[PDB]
Every structure is written in structure tokens, then in C-alpha cells.
Amino acid sequence: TGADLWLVIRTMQERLGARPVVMQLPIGREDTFSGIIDVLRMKAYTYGNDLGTDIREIPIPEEYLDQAREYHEKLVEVAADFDENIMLKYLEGEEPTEEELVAAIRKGTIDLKITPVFLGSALKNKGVQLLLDAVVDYLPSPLDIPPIKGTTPEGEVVEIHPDPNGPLAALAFKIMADPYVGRLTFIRVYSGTLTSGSYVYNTTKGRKERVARLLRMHANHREEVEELKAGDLGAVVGLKETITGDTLVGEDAPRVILESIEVPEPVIDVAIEPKTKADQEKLSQALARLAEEDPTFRVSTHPETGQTIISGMGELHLEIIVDRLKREFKVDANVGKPQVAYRETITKPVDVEGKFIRQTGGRGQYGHVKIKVEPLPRGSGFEFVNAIVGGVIPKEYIPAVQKGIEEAMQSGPLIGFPVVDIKVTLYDGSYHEVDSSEMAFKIAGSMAIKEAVQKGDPVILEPIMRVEVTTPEEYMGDVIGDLNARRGQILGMEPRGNAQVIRAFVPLAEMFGYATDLRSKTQGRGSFVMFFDHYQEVPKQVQEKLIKG
Amino acid sequence: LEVIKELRAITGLGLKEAKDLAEKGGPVKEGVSKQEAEEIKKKLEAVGAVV
Amino acid sequence: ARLVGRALELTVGFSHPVVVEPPEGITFEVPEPTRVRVSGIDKQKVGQVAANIRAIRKPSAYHEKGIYYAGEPVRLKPGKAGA
């Protein structure tokens, strides 16, 4: 209900912006379809009956024929801007028959500059033979296809000629779990040849690799082949290692290389915690079948505490692979919202008093610490000073005790979470040569610090971030809306590549995952990137339900 | 040389009516816009409208 | 919206066709099935029955679809709001 021509040929250059050019005409509107009167060979084809076994070409009953003229005449005009016959031939007025016609249009078609909208229908078997034939008439093969960028075993370029004779240059791509035989990969050769009785050589992670069987998955059945043409494609039975998109050479081939870098970066990130982790390993080897056959996602273990992070592009992406979960693997889990990479701090410096001057009688090991401290603005770094008041505790009594600070740092006093953006500054202390020691002063440090954090004004910061939202403008308004409505402040205004891109301070804990949103507003045009700046406090009170313990 | 450069409407759209050549135009001035004077009427061309 | 027979036959989002038969004090008219006119004589039956047409279908809501005598659509954000 909404048959067209018009609105379509509009919604080409009002979505991207490119000269289309059409090559036929739909007889009537919705459910008022017969066939197509082509403005190419200039004829009204149709079926009458829906199918295509009692078709016809039945005389165009005037109606739109005349109209077609204007439409059809467009044809000629276009070929006056690419050809070398049809400038002067649009000038002349002569009839351009399918001699240079098909050549001009094929030229433009493989030139990436033409959109000969053929259509038809479907259940309404319209456009079957129409686009079968149109596809032969203008949709090309490896003749016009340019050398698919690949690289050399030293670092230079070459051409991936069809060349059925020479250099055995190869690529595969599609790792597929087939039942009848097994791991099958779908492949495009590129150069040389290959027999269903040969080896090759994996030219990423080496293996001369027996090619067992060459074949083609074909309609209702399957056609097997004993050889495969250079430029043609196929499927291969064999190959146990190999990856999705790894450089390939043959036996005869001298260990060359391939390119096609590609980027399947992750955007939506949600973390996992199963039943009692009794299935974690099953799902890890699952990720061997997964982050490899379709390397899409990342299995980046928690760069901090206990909870593996599993990141990926899209969202339902993650969902379909979490559906692969409770079927083949049949494992139960809890894909929680990620915790919080955590580091505390303070705002006030204090003259704290730390101790460890303890013995008994006949074994020294003292540890006194009259320390002073001071922090630092959020996201600047961490250093310190000496504060020697004459060299009171020299030699071995410097780095280990400082490590006392560190070993009081790996477990921040409130809930055992780190501290950064600081700048210490001790000043006084005591000891005794044979009656003090290394680790003694280490725990001097640890202790001193522990009170120098617990009784010194507590506060934690939450992992702040930066981001580039690549987007149009309608939803520049929308996105900035919910962007500020995610607790933080943007900061970033520049008219980028195609449209406009907003730079944004965001908080992660309240900025987590925007792709699902990004598409919700912007339909699906241009996303965002996870930068890291540092961390800021959570409005002094949000952390009250969070100090739950 | 004028239709594939100045005239936006390609080479067969502005001169759609090249069936009987019916098109004139092209502005000009004195001092500044002497780019459209004789460098579009000096390069072996011929539009005798004003300057 | 059709002037078939003498009266209203129209679909406005619904599947089942909406039929409306004219009472006395009015005559019917449908030019192009995307705009309709009645020609009658009673300011009571004018607005009562015409707002009964605006009751044949509720207007706009978020964007714009339905019946307006000549009214107007006000937008209420669709790509978010409800979350």
C-alpha cells in the first residue's frame, strides 16, 4: 500500500546524495500492477496473471507511453556526460540502439555512478526475468573488478590479477560449523587456481595445510568441483587452524601476504557473573568457537577486580550471542551492569601520627612515623617529596616504607578501594640501627597511611570519560538533551566530516552504553567512542547506599 | 568549454534545447568582475551580449 | 474516503470501513478521498456531528494522523519521552 517511482527516486538523494538514473516504468499503483514498461529497450512487458507462466508484452494501451518519453529521454542526456559518442549524439537526435547503449550504461554502472532502478515485485512474481536479464545486462564480473588490495612478503604492492596461470594468491573468510563434514570456510581465491587435491599454506600463522575438498553450496543441492578458478569463489573442506580473514597462499605461492584490515570495534559493554562459575570454562572454550569464527567481540577480563568484561558492537548483537548461550552451551548466568573501577581520595592535609615501634627483648624491628600528607586535583597524577630534616632515617628506610604507603593504597580504608591524585610529604620519624628494619618501616608506612586516610575526610571518585558523538543535528538537539541528562557535561562543538560531532565529558557509571540510545534517536547514523580522562566524586550522597557494608 | 565549467546543468541539461540552441547569459562588471568579460569571450568563444 | 452510494465510507487506520449515513438538514460531498465536505443547514448539527467526525478519529498524538476539521498537530517527542 504505497507503490511508487516518485518517492523512491526522491529518497535516494535525500538520504545520501547521488545521481540515481532509472531504466523502466511501473504500470499503476499498489495492487494495480501488471508488469513494467521499460524505458530501456522501450517496451511494455508484463505477466497479466501474477505468476510468470502466462506472461505477455501486450500493446501499451496509450496511457503512459507518451509520458515515458520524458522519463526515457533522460537516458540520452546522462550518456552525454560520460561517453564520447553521445555528447554529439544527444546533439544529433539519432536513435542510440543497444550498441553503445549497453556500453555507456555498463560503464557508468561499474563506474559507481548510476542507479538503473529496476524493480518489480515478489509473491507477485514481477521483476523475476526482468532483473535476471537486467543483472546480466549491467551487473559485472571480475573483468571490471579492480585488484583487491593485498600486500607483499617484504612490504609493497602487487595486482590481484585473475590470471588463471601464475602466482597462487588466495583468501578465505567464512568459518562455518557444518554438520555433514565440519569446519568449512567460504573463500575467494583471487589468483592462481586450486585443485581438490593439493595443499596450500596459511600465511598468518603458518601451516602448509592440506586442501581436502573444493566445492560449492548450490541451491537445493550442492555441486562439487575438483578445481577452482582464479577470481571465482567457493567453499573449502579441511583447514583446522586458520581464522576469519587470514592471509592465504598456496603451495606454489611464495609466502606472500594480504591486507583488508577492517575494524569491528565494541560499543555496548555489559559484564558477566554466572551461577557459581562452574560453567565459566565451558563458555570460555565457547569463546574459542566465538571470538575467532566471528572475532566481533572482546573478552577483556576485568582490568581491576573480579568480573570478566565482555564487550561488543551493537546491543542485540550481545543478545543473540547470549541466546547462543542457553542452547548449545545451555549455561546459566547473570550479565550484570559492570561494577565500578574505584579509587578514593581526600580534600584535606593532616599531621597524622603512625606507630610500629615494637620489640619484646632481643630482636629489634622498630617502625615510627610522624608523617604529613596532601592530595591533588582530580586526574593530575601522583608524586611526593622527601622532607628530610637532616637525614633522620636514611638508607634502607625510604622505598620500602613508601611501599608501606602503596600496600596501604591497594585497599582504601572505607571499603578496600584505592586512592589517587595525591602528593604526600612526611617530615619526621624515629628508629634504631640494629633495633629497626625494612618491613618494619614498610608497615610503619602502611599504618601511618591507614589512619591518614580513615581519620582524614573520606571520598571516592567515579570513572569519568570523554566521547565523540558523530551525528546529524535534529538529534544533536535530542542527544545533547539526554547527554546532559546523564549527570555530566559535554564540552565539545565542531562541524565534522558529514555533519556535527559533539565532544563530551561523561561519567560511565551514568554514561554506560549509548549505542542502543544512539540508534533510538538518530535512527542509526554515526556512533560514539570511549575515552578516559579520570574520575570525579558521586554527588557526596549517592555513595551512601554504596557504603553498604 | 562553457557548459562543463560555468553552466552547472551539465553539458546536456542547460543546453537541453541544443536541438535549436536557445540559451544566453553570464554577468560582468567593470574593474573586479572582469573575469567573466574577456576570459570567457577571449578563449576562442563567442557570447556577444554585453562585454 | 468515498462518496459511494450517497454517504461516508472511509478507513483511517482501522481495518473495518467506517460508514456514515446523512440525516435531514444535510447533503453530501466527497471530492478527493483525502478531504471531505458536507453541505447542510444547522449550526447545531454542524458542530455536533462534525466533532462526531473528529470522534470518528482522534487527531495527531506525537505526530500527525487522523481527522481535523481544520485543526492543528502539536508534537510530543516520540523518539524518547517514554522511558
Place this chain on the structure above:
Amino acid sequence: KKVVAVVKLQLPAGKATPAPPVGPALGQHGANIMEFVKAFNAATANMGDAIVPVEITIYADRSFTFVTKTPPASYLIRKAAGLEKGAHKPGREKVGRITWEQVLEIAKQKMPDLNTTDLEAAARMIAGSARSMGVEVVGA
């Protein structure tokens, strides 16, 4: 074939980014705002740059003709009062030095703008704005 699309804007010498409204009004004009920041820097070589409204005209086909105006008063008072940029709370704090004195020159060299089409009237508009911009217009 644009029938008159003469379009002005707000651009100082040296800031060439032909984005809207340069795009939908002068982009469909093919005017050189690149040549703007270049040659406009020439006719205005007093400090190289200054905020001045451009204006490019298209003529039935594609003829070009750009026109210009004047800088903002919040610069005429600034780099002549000792008020480096701002002052905060323009009434309580009297920092600068434009008294009843140099205001004669400042108001002088700007004529084809303001509002009063003369110089003996809105010079009090001048005398007040200096306060609005946090400067002492002390008596003399």
C-alpha cells in the same frame, strides 16, 4: 539559477568555515569565503583581524560581490581603557580609565553604525555602555 541570494554574516578576518548559513545561502552561490578571510585581511590590515559583517551577492547566474562593515564597541573601549577583557559586575568595580576624555576619539572613528545617525546624542549611550562593560567613566 538563484534569483538574488545576497547574504551577509558575522565573520572576522581569518576564520574560514563555509558552514550554514554560508552553506544553504552562499554555498548555493559558490562564493569565496576563503577569499574573504584572505583579501579581507588586506583592506583591514590594522591588526590583521577584526569582527566585520560580510555580504556576498549572487546575480541571476553566478556573479560575486562582497561587502563589509565595522567591529564591536566591546573592543573600542577595551583596548583603550586598560580593561583587558572583563571586569565582573560592571557597576561595583571601577577598573579602567576611559573618563570624559578619550571617549571623544573612540566615539569619533565610528560613524556609519550605532543608532543616532550623528555624534552628539547616543554618545551617552556610549557613556553608559562603558559602565555596562565594567569600566570607570570617571568625570573629567
Place this chain on the structure above:
Amino acid sequence: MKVRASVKRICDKCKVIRRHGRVYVICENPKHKQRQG
């Protein structure tokens, strides 16, 4: 915010009327709908 013993106007679309009984509060945005209950 329908129904409450006090009822007031914020913008000039907001107004008060009598009909079939008690007080009624209206506005252009009918989000400002009340009653005296």
C-alpha cells in the same frame, strides 16, 4: 494533577469554570487539569 481542594493558575492558558457542579481548572496543556475534591 487532577482533584484537590485548592486549585490555581500558573500560565494565562490556565482558567476556572463552573459546570454541572464544583470548580474546574483548565489550560492549553491539559497537563494542568484539576478539580476541587
Place this chain on the structure above:
RNA sequence: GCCAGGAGGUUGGCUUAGAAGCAGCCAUCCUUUAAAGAGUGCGUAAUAGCUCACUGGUCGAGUGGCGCCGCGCCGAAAAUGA
């Protein structure tokens, strides 16, 4: 109720990623005048923009606000049937 401007320094200062009368804080000048407010609400990411105060007309006889004394109105939902 209508046509019409509803301006300019000014995007006031300032902060601010930007803050244009309009998020906000500090905040009073005058000008082409019949008339425009360092601007009333709306609006934009912030401009742009609807705006109203101002003012002239069109036009024809009243009009809008405040303080007061009475009566009614709501605020008002229970367990047998009134």
C-alpha cells in the same frame, strides 16, 4: 479585535564547551521615536524564531483593577435499609 514597527550599541557585563532579553549572578544608559522594555513568557545545543509591554491608526461606547457587608459553592469517603 485588526495593519505596523516591536529597533541599535547589546551577543550588556561576567562566567562559560557556548550562555546572545532570555540558565544564571552583577546589574538602571541612551539613541532613529508615534514606539520598543539592558526585555514577558515561549523557543534553539547557544543563535535564528512566535511573542508581549510600547505606539499610531482603524472604531465605537464604556471598561479594567483594588478595599468592603450579607447568602450560597467546594474542601465532604464506612461497614443492616433510609
